[PDB]
Amino acid sequence: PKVSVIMTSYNKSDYVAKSISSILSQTFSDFELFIMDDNSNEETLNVIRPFLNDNRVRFYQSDISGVKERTEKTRYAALINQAIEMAEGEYITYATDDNIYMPDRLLKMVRELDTHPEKAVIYSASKTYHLNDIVKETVRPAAQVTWNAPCAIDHCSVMHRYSVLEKVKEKFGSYWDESPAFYRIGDARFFWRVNHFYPFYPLDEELDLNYITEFVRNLPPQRNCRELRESLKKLGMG
Ligand SMILES: O=c1ccn([C@@H]2O[C@H](COP(=O)(O)OP(=O)(O)O)[C@@H](O)[C@H]2O)c(=O)[nH]1
Numbered sequence: 001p002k003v004s005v006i007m008t009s010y011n012k013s014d015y016v017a018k019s020i021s022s023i024l025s026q027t028f029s030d031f032e033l034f035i036m037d038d039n040s041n042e043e044t045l046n047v048i049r050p051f052l053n054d055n056r057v058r059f060y061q062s063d064i065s066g067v068k069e070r071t072e073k074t075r076y077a078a079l080i081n082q083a084i085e086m087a088e089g090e091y092i093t094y095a096t097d098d099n100i101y102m103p104d105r106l107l108k109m110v111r112e113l114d115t116h117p118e119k120a121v122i123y124s125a126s127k128t129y130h131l132n133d134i135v136k137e138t139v140r141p142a143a144q145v146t147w148n149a150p151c152a153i154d155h156c157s158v159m160h161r162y163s164v165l166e167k168v169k170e171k172f173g174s175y176w177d178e179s180p181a182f183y184r185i186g187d188a189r190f191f192w193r194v195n196h197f198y199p200f201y202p203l204d205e206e207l208d209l210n211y212i213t214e215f216v217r218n219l220p221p222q223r224n225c226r227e228l229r230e231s232l233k234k235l236g237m238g
């Protein structure tokens with residue numbers, strides 16, 4: 001396949017079917033979808049089950065159980081790293097169990113990378129609807145090329161060439177950072193690694209949507225956004 005979509009899942013039974021359906025109905029259909037379930041409860045696994053009949057889905061379930069194992073590593077970074085090692089696509093993109101892709105997301109992002117060989121990482125705008133009907137609507141624009149993506153751009157709004165993963169692994173030893181000190185902001189920490197070598201190019205369209213309507217005590221102190229952002233400003237790549 002041209003694209004590898006990597007989705008992480010953990011106990012969001014009321015949302016995961018809408019997320020998976022949004023990917024399977026994409027107008028660009030040449031992808032493989034990894035569904036990396038982190039050993040969710042029965043209700044969630046039963047919602048996911050029928051989607052395993054789609055021949056593009058590659059379903060993996062971890063054996064993770066209990067607070068020690070849940071807090072040893074940033075779990076979605078570990079699962080994304082596992083999927084990357086099995087990925088066959090030229091372009092890599094990410095999805096979560098509570099985010100929805102707009103129907104033309106893959107077509108438009110693939111076209112941006114096919115059309116501009118000089119771009120290696122692209123990001124789109126993102127929208128969040130607050131329900132209570134809609135009480136609030138938030139948009140995260142994609143209006144400029146940026147060398148400082150941490151906490152400005154979400155996990156679910158990006159697509160990049162597989163070759164980006166090579167450069168990152170050469171300097172850092174892994175793709176995503178599995179250290180549990182970056183649990184709250186794992187996507188930002190991966191973007192911080194990518195931003196040592198590549199800027200993020202904007203695609204000014206809202207292509208992903210979010211609907212908002214013992215574990216925490218066993219994590220190490222959480223590093224923050226300001227730390228990553230200041231570190232890149234200091235790095236001075238743009
Ligand atoms: O033990 C866990 C907890 C979460 N996740 C996944 O991590 C991603 C980010 O999680 P969450 O939505 O809880 O984070 P937030 O929205 O706070 O960034 C989601 O795909 C979850 O399914 C996971 O794989 N294992």
Ligand SMILES: [Mg+2]
Nearest residue numbers: 155184185187
């Ligand atoms: Mg987040």
Ligand SMILES: [Mn+2]
Nearest residue numbers: 096097098099
């Ligand atoms: Mn979430």
